[PDB]
Amino acid sequence: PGIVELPTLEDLKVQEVKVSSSVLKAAAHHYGAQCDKPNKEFMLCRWEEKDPRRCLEEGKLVNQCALDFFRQIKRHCAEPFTEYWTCIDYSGLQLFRHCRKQQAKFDECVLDKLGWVRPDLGELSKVTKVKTDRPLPENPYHSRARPEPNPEAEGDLKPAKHGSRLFFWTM
Amino acid sequence: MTMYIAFILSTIFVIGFVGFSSKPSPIYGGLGLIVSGGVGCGIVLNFGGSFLGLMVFLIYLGGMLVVFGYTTAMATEMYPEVWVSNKTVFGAFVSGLMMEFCMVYYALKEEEVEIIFKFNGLGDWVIYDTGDSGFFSEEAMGIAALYSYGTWLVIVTGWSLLIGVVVIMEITRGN
């Protein structure tokens, strides 16, 4: 019953952004604020199509955009980022609480050099919208033809013919 | 190889059950149940059921405690039975060992054991599911939904426990 659709080994070949969890959590809010659009459209594709085979291009786009973002932050203040991600790494929970000093030292650079602002609490949490030129997934589940309903019945209740009609009962 | 542990956890569950059901001295059936529950807590735990596993741990190792509480009170006698007293208990025990052993031998050879339902001998690690949980345990959140969606369940239970303490009062009242 069908076989496969698996894209070629060449298809799912992207430069895998190879950074550590501490670095990623240190970037976080700035990375999201400056790279939301590819991410938003990518997982809009993921939830709509319900089908990653249709969203590889979105994956390439989000990877490349995040990589560009990482290249720009490398081009500018990285020693504050270096100290920040190291300090976050020392935490066993990657807690943002015991890093605030370096946090300021980071947030200022991308503010006065790359023109970025740290998103407010809940600011990068409200559900947004994004235009995607791809068509709608008319049948995301690829459902078949739904079974026809029961034959609809109608008509006023005329009195039962000859009453109960059970054995000898006249009515 | 500790690969097969998720298998053997159930296996020690089985033969700890048989001796528990081998009709030995009541405390030895209790010991069988105790090892069975201790090894089954691992069975639920390694499947992700941390809270349910520790829950059955707690309540059940209190529950067999209380069934002991009358075993030395309302069940002992001059000569308590021994796990070797009766001759038939050994036969029951060995009949416990050889059945699932033969069946698992078949499931290791044919993987299509025909006993009752349809079963495959290819371990258990497969049946797990890939995915994630974000920052919430599914089991804990599900059992927490008792106070939001368990509208009827908690009501009917609490009523039943009240009726239970009432009946426990009445039957043991002794006029």
Binding site: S91 | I27, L54, L58, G62, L65, F68, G69, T72, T76
Partner: protein, 318 residues
């Protein structure tokens, strides 16, 4: 090096239990105008070694009217559970980060009944058979109060992760928020470890020992090791649960020192209470919790579950 860390957990706890048998005989004596043991080495420091050697090389008598299987298994259960119940404790970095550490350890706390019952019945003596049921009833009837107290206290912590408990306290000692609760909890702890005010199992007039009567030498000493390891373990539990401490991640040793000082203080309070108070009676012993402790605990739990809601201060789940 994981097994090395394990051994570094067991062995020091064993020396701690060993020297607790000296600090109790010194503290009690000084509380009752006695110099205590100071003949075996300097200030009696070597005395626990001598008694341990004696009990190891004392003859372990086999109870003739007994089934040896439980006579050997019961010390195994009592001792092994007592030590493995130290596993998930929040030292500055707890050994095993079990997501349900408090529930884990509370569940294992109920298992001491599973040594008490086999010891009391297998040894097959009147004192043993009495004390088995009496002590079982004690510990099981106080386990419930321990449970509701734990739940009510935790309702302000956030979860059953026992490492985040420190994060709960941080600013203020948790007792400042649940001193009525802790006052019960501590006492119930005193009840669960079978200590002189609440022991009721020794009762050296009508129970003599209760459970450790026919046990001799080694298996006998194993139940003492379990008993005086539960002392330290539950005093440490109470110490973190209510008597919080500071913990800078760059300096783990600070919280370690504060925590061990708290544990020593609480154990000294244990010895303090036992050196003064009379011993409960079984009638009053269960009257204390059924008639008095349990209703207050229920009401306090209701208070401590309603409180986070009305203050809009529910604790963080993760």
């Amino acid at each position: 090096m994981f097994m090395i860390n394990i051994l570094s957990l067991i062995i020091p706890i064993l020396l701690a239990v060993a020297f607790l048998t000296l600090v109790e005989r010194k503290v009690l004596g000084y509380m009752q105008l006695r110099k205590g043991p100071n003949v075996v080495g300097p200030y009696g420091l070597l005395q626990p070694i001598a008694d341990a050697l004696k009990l190891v090389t004392k003859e372990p008598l086999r109870p003739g009217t007994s089934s040896i299987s439980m006579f050997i298994i019961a010390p195994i259960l009592g001792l092994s559970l007592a030590l493995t119940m130290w596993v998930p404790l929040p030292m500055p970095y707890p050994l095993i980060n079990m997501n349900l550490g408090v529930l884990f350890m509370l569940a294992m706390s109920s298992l001491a009944v599973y040594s008490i019952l086999w010891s009391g019945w297998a040894s097959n003596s009147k004192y043993a058979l009495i004390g088995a049921l009496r002590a079982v009833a004690q510990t099981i009837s106080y386990e419930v109060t321990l449970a509701i107290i734990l739940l009510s206290v935790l309702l302000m912590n956030g979860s059953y992760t026992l490492s985040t408990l420190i994060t709960t306290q941080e600013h203020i000692w948790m007792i400042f928020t649940s001193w009525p609760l802790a006052m019960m909890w501590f006492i119930s702890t005193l009840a669960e470890t079978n200590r002189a005010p609440f022991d009721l199992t020794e009762g050296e007039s009508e129970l003599v020992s209760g459970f450790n009567v026919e046990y001799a030498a080694g298996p006998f000493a194993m139940f003492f090791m379990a008993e005086y390891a539960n002392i330290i373990m539950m005093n440490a539990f109470t110490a973190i649960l209510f008597l919080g401490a500071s913990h800078d991640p760059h300096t783990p040793e600070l919280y370690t020192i504060n925590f061990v000082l708290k544990t020593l203080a609480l154990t000294i309070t244990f010895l303090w209470i036992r050196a003064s108070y009379p011993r409960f009676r079984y009638d009053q012993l269960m009257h204390l919790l059924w008639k008095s402790f349990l209703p207050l605990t229920l009401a306090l739990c209701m208070w401590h579950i309603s409180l986070p809601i009305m203050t809009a201060s529910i604790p963080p789940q993760s």
